[PDB]
Design a protein around this ligand. Structure first.
Ligand SMILES: COc1cc2nncc(-c3cnc(N4CCC(C(C)(C)O)CC4)c(C)c3)c2cc1OC
Ligand SMILES: COc1cc2nncc(-c3cnc(N4CCC(C(C)(C)O)CC4)c(C)c3)c2cc1OC
Ligand SMILES: COc1cc2nncc(-c3cnc(N4CCC(C(C)(C)O)CC4)c(C)c3)c2cc1OC
Ligand SMILES: [Zn+2]
Ligand SMILES: [Zn+2]
Ligand SMILES: [Zn+2]
Ligand SMILES: [Zn+2]
Ligand SMILES: [Zn+2]
Ligand SMILES: [Zn+2]
Lengths: 318, 318, 318
């Protein structure tokens, strides 16, 4: 049979990639046509060679790719990079997650920014975009999930077709919650709640609502993982992130609204301080809390701390 | 019937766009997939919901879009922007124009830069481009009109198929004259003639040759409308315009010909003075004459004057 | 018949292009859709109007075009530019080459960088790219030839189908050797061998191994021809070349490896000196040796010397 042939197959990457893909700070490289193979490899090791029908999975991946746009940062590369961070979290916390959760989270990560234009929810609201009228909160993230479902509904694209309806509904809920959690506006309340539950000892991974929160934080951690790479990667990725911010800032000015300094290309000198503020208020607390809840995710925090030191070095002019 | 269903339909934009589209200084935004809807809305309000068969119009628009190139300034965005300026002129001078003229001018504006490479007529002549051998004068503009006719001749693309042959020939003439008028080399003689006719009182909109001239000036005014937007839009658009000039300047240097300072990227410091010269010699007289002939177009002149003040502010280092 | 109709046809370029295409320092221009016609013209003058079936040749050219990537320098424009330099060498040494060699070398030049990503062999090795595992030496060049053969094997794409098998095998060998010779790592040993054979008088164009070497040097000379154009072209092309180097340098840093100064975007100030070093160690000796072997290629050397003087002028701050 088809599932039998797939059970005998072994997907391999080049030697260097096989070794370094296990590292949290792994970079997926500039060869776009290798990314699908990298994702499939990650799925095979974390879930198993029989989790998805290979032909369907490849079809799904290429359709997802086609629905990411040619923008500086929120592109196809970002999707696969976020998926890799989730892979590393899953592999280092392997006894914690179900089969469905492992399937769902890698797929959710790949799909989490589908059809992103490179603008924030705030801009869409201010521009009075049709999407903002349809989704009052988490505008883009609700759209990302809608795009995911549309791709799954295409002929030969339902990678979950072997699941029972019960399991199908469960994995789609996992995916929906995970994608919505990537709305950074929801992160602040989530981390604060998780911190309180961790300190009191009420935090229980057997409680579904607690579990959803932890997954939500994992999604933030993966989404922000540019700050957890080695310095050369972290610095170069920041260029792409700010390219998008400045473009939004330009568009804000066109609406007659002065953008925040983060999005203003006339205030490039304020970036190092802005980075310091971002690490202190967002990135460091994210990985600190995640490390508390999941100690094997420690390397993410260490790398984030190291990049913080590097930005401080920039500020001093060193 | 089909025309009956269309008569009952109402096309609407988001609330902010409905309000601000009526403003001369409106910016169409960075969401490309909203531009076709914006154009259709403008056609519906200025001409009527029964001027074009909707399915044919949409097919036509997408084909026009496909025939604009990915260049910094003479692109699909420019086409829709010029069309909007014409919409605002038409709406504020609504008793003056026939049904055919309103149809023709919006379509002419959308098609006026079809297949533009981002190079001027002068460069094509000097490079000895096949187009320059075919069209000795108004080289690109003659090509734009030829592209328009080619699109109209495609199956299911003749948006004027309901017109009589007499009316069809009239609208195509309106379109041809309007597109040729966007050759800025022809503007100087046209404005000068219009100024003389306005001062003597010989200018008569009932005279076809006079009428053609006024339409020609309207086309220049719409074509140049970047200088009539608010300062943030005007300044950012100037970046795109000069990107193309510098690219042509590079190509001129490759032919062994020193380009004019306007096209020389080594002389970026001369841009503010070059802008002052452009407003004084071209933009201000254009909108001054247009305002004299059509007083409701006044906001274009006011905005042009304000941008002139801003460029003077740049020169002073303020 | 079909070959008879083609024998009566005459392909012509615009007047300026017909004249200036014969010059070694000719620039092909920014009009992409004219490049196929330029190549066909060169083939017709150097080989003959009956060397290729026109319909097959055009199909082949468009497929080759489709398999070049949108990279700063190793793109479709580079392919046609290298082909032009070969055309000029062939035309000025017209009694030396067979029909097969003229066919082969122009096609080899057009195909010599097929599917280039803008990265060197060294980067692919260090990234552990699948291609490096398959081709241990001349990694990209072996891939370029493989892409060439794949295009020729497509239906209606075998432009050499009229050749006998013997001749077909000969032209494919000419093409293979020529493409492999564009590996600049192989150039240094080749030029050194040719210099020794020239000085002793052992160099004999009737010896196949000697002939292969000379063709190899011709391929280097054509590949590097940016340094043989007039200064404005040479300077602007250098921008594209370094754009690719800096991108590779960024990727090297992402692997945790400090790149050589040539590829480091933080060391832009070292470029003029790097250019001086490149001309002295690579470009000048290449064209000096080529001019010794083929005196009519002299203009390439003169232009290279002139560009060397220009870079020295930059260093002095003049
Ligand atoms: C590496 O640096 C960053 C990475 C990042 N990665 N992902 C997301 C962001 C980022 C994206 N947007 C953010 N917002 C959006 C809303 C904006 C307001 C609400 C003021 O419109 C506040 C800032 C914030 C705070 C961060 C982010 C920001 C970064 O620097 C500020
Ligand atoms: C906002 O600034 C401009 C907007 C513009 N929008 N549209 C068109 C132009 C522009 C385009 N080209 C122009 N020409 C072309 C011919 C050129 C010669 C004839 C010397 O080759 C003279 C300048 C001129 C004078 C203006 C134009 C120029 C502008 O600044 C000079
Ligand atoms: C116009 O300037 C150049 C044109 C060029 N055109 N083609 C190729 C190159 C070029 C491409 N790569 C080169 N290498 C690749 C290997 C690299 C090592 C082996 C150190 O990785 C040494 C430099 C070298 C020496 C030259 C080249 C380099 C140039 O400047 C250095
Ligand atoms: Zn997102
Ligand atoms: Zn994201
Ligand atoms: Zn034009
Ligand atoms: Zn225009
Ligand atoms: Zn090469
Ligand atoms: Zn090459």
């Amino acid at each position: 049979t088809s599932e039998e042939w797939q059970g005998l197959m072994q997907f391999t990457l080049p030697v260097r990639l096989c070794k370094e893909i296990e590292l949290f700070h792994f970079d997926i490289g500039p060869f776009e046509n290798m990314w699908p193979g990298i994702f499939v490899y990650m799925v095979h090791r974390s879930c198993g060679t029989s989790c998805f029908e290979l032909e369907k999975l490849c079809r799904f991946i290429m359709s997802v790719k086609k629905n990411y746009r040619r923008v500086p940062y929120h592109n196809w590369k970002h999707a696969v990079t976020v998926a890799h961070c989730m892979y590393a979290i899953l592999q280092n916390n392997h006894t914690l997650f179900t089969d469905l959760e492992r399937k769902g989270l890698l797929i959710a990560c790949l799909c989490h920014d589908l059809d992103h234009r490179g603008f924030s929810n705030s801009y869409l609201q201010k521009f009075d975009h049709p999407l903002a009228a349809l989704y009052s909160t988490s505008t883009m993230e609700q759209h990302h999930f809608s795009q995911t479902v549309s791709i799954l509904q295409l002929e030969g694209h339902n990678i979950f077709s072997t699941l029972s309806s019960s399991e199908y509904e469960q994995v789609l809920e996992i995916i929906r919650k995970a994608i919505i959690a990537t709305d950074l506006a929801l992160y602040f309340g989530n981390r604060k709640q998780l911190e309180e539950m961790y300190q009191t000892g009420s935090l229980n991974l057997n409680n579904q609502s607690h579990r959803d929160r932890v997954i939500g934080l994992m999604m933030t951690a993966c989404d922000l993982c540019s700050v957890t790479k080695l310095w050369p990667v972290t610095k170069l990725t920041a260029n792409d992130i700010y390219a998008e911010f400045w473009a939004e800032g330009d568009e804000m000015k066109k609406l007659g609204i002065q953008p925040i300094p983060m999005m203003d290309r006339d205030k490039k000198d304020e970036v190092p301080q802005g980075q310091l503020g971002f690490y202190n208020a967002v990135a460091i607390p994210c990985y600190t809390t995640l490390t508390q809840i999941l100690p094997p995710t420690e390397p993410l925090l260490k790398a984030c701390r190291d990049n913080l030191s590097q930005w401080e070095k920039v500020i001093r002019g060193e």
